[PDB]
Amino acid sequence: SQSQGIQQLLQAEKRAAEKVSEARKRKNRRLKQAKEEAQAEIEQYRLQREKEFKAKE
Amino acid sequence: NFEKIENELKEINTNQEALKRNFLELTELKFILRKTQQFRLGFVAGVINRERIPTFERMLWRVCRGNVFLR
């Protein structure tokens, strides 16, 4: 009888914690990838500014 | 002396009533905790006279649209 409800409550909190923990890990991974892609574009800008400065000189 | 007795009785009666109420409420809480300890969700817990349970449970299943877990 009551054991089914006990299991449903415990498993409900476990299911919630899993989906939220995986989505929080995904969020942090996406923000890290945003910073990495940003730095790649920032290096390309720096390199272009250097090439232009050499040409001006 | 009359004031002493009067004030003692008033104070002691007031305190006896309050303490007896608190004692009975904590007695209910002892049982409530012992049963509840067997078990983002939310919950509430309490005590009622048994004769109200049929109407109480049916109203929970009526106010919530068929969805409530009760023990």
From Swiss-Prot, chain B:
It is found in: Cytoplasmic vesicle, Clathrin-coated vesicle membrane; Cytoplasmic vesicle, Secretory vesicle, Synaptic vesicle membrane; Melanosome. Subunit of the V0 complex of vacuolar(H+)-ATPase (V-ATPase), a multisubunit enzyme composed of a peripheral complex (V1) that hydrolyzes ATP and a membrane integral complex (V0) that translocates protons. V-ATPase is responsible for the acidification of various organelles, such as lysosomes, endosomes, the trans-Golgi network, and secretory granules, including synaptic vesicles. In certain cell types, can be exported to the plasma membrane, where it is involved in the acidification of the extracellular environment. Required for assembly and activity of the vacuolar ATPase. Belongs to the V-ATPase 116 kDa subunit family. V-ATPase is a heteromultimeric enzyme made up of two complexes: the ATP-hydrolytic V1 complex and the proton translocation V0 complex. The V1 complex consists of three catalytic AB heterodimers that form a heterohexamer, three peripheral stalks each consisting of EG heterodimers, one central rotor including subunits D and F, and the regulatory subunits C and H. The proton translocation complex V0 consists of the proton transport subunit a, a ring of proteolipid subunits c9c'', rotary subunit d, subunits e and f, and the accessory subunits ATP6AP1/Ac45 and ATP6AP2/PRR. Interacts with SPAAR. This is V-type proton ATPase 116 kDa subunit a 1. It comes from Rattus norvegicus (Rat). The chain holds residues 100 to 198 of 838 of the full protein.
